Design an enzyme around this catalytic site. Structure first.
Site, PDB file in Angstrom:
ATOM      1  CD  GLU A  18       9.232 -53.423   7.077  1.00 40.85           C
ATOM      2  OE1 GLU A  18       8.057 -53.005   7.028  1.00 40.85           O
ATOM      3  OE2 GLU A  18       9.569 -54.591   6.803  1.00 40.85           O
ATOM      4  CE  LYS A  32      17.016 -48.173  10.280  1.00 39.46           C
ATOM      5  NZ  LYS A  32      17.713 -47.096  11.028  1.00 39.46           N
ATOM      6  CG  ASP A 133      18.406 -39.181  16.078  1.00 40.09           C
ATOM      7  OD1 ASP A 133      17.819 -38.403  16.874  1.00 40.09           O
ATOM      8  OD2 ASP A 133      17.780 -40.033  15.407  1.00 40.09           O
TER       9      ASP A 133
END
Ligand SMILES: Cc1nc2ccc(-c3ccnc4ccccc34)c(C)c2c(=O)[nH]1
Length: 296
Positions: A18, A32, A133
């Site tokens: 989250e 985070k 990513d």
């Protein structure tokens, strides 16, 4: 630090964990809290931010790593600067862009990626780093209109001196939608650092496309779409992406209207040179940065 921050609002939840907007010393921060399935991403980002001291205006601003034990388990926290405007993916759906704003977005992403990819020399100089990513949800939009790249959980590091490659040890795999063809057909030479940079350029060309569509010219703009929106479903599978990118050698379509704007035309050529099936024909981050810097 962590037992010092007031969690104010959850702005993100997912398999990663989250993300919270918190107050810390009277200012907003992003927090985070990683899922247990994703601890290795936290170790990697802590390594890149703390040990490697990764810092650049177009890299998400690191504040602290922390661990907190509650409820008979230990949470892994990553605290960074907070960007009110959120992810590039969200931003692109809320506004159109003009030429200056478009270039500012793509040049800043290019400057962050070039910073990642280029080794810094000297006694404790940054290794070369491939992100692995890259995608619009992993880019934040800053108030000044530039962006910064986030999520180093899959970073790979190389040092020319020692020619040491550090692939880390993370079970997480990248976002399938942005995977280069050599990832999807499993030909990528995983012990060659250049391979990981080239994968980054592929994803960068896809981000470029995403942003370019939102730049207005001639009162024309394309609606926000993710790459391959028209040929794969939400949450695409490996085989979905392979059939499109590898089997049918498809790339995102260049809107005809782009050829009516000298900036969009330059960007169209740029992104197509990120999309070669042959990884070694793709442009480098620095060359992209240099090209984007000559545009106006
Ligand atoms: C509105 C808003 N949403 C966000 C969502 C995710 C992340 C975020 C993305 C990637 N790694 C992170 C690591 C630590 C903390 C946050 C992140 C951020 C920074 C933001 C933000 O700054 N503002």
């Amino acid at each position: 630090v962590a037992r010092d921050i007031t969690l104010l609002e959850c702005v993100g939840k997912g398999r990663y964990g989250e993300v919270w907007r918190g107050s810390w010393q009277g200012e907003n921060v992003a927090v985070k809290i990683f899922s247990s399935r994703d601890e290795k991403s936290w170790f990697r980002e802590t390594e890149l931010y703390n040990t490697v001291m990764l810092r650049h205006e177009n890299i998400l601003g690191f504040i602290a790593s922390d661990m907190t034990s509650r409820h008979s388990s230990t949470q892994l926290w990553l605290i960074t600067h907070y960007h009110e405007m959120g992810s590039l993916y969200d931003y692109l759906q809320l506004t159109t862009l003009d030429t200056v704003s478009c270039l500012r977005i793509v040049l800043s992403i290019a400057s962050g990626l070039a910073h990642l990819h280029i080794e810094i020399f000297g006694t404790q100089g940054k290794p070369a780093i491939a992100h692995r990513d890259l995608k619009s949800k992993n880019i934040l939009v800053k108030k000044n209109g530039q962006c910064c790249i986030a999520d180093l959980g899959l970073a790979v590091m190389h040092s020319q001196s020692t020619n040491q490659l550090d692939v880390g040890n993370n079970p997480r795999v990248g976002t399938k939608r942005y995977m280069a063809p050599e990832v999807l057909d499993e030909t990528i030479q995983v012990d060659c650092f250049d391979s990981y940079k080239r994968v980054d350029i592929w994803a960068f060309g896809l981000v470029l496309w995403e942003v370019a569509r939102r730049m207005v010219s001639n009162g024309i703009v394309e609606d926000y779409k993710p790459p391959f929106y028209d040929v794969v479903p939400n949450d695409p599978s490996f085989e979905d992406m392979r059939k499109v990118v590898c089997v049918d050698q498809q790339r995102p379509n260049i809107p005809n209207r782009w050829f009516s704007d000298p900036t969009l035309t330059s960007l169209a050529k740029l992104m197509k040179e990120c999309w070669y099936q042959n990884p070694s024909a793709r442009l480098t981050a620095l060359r992209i940065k240099k090209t984007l810097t000559k545009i106006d």
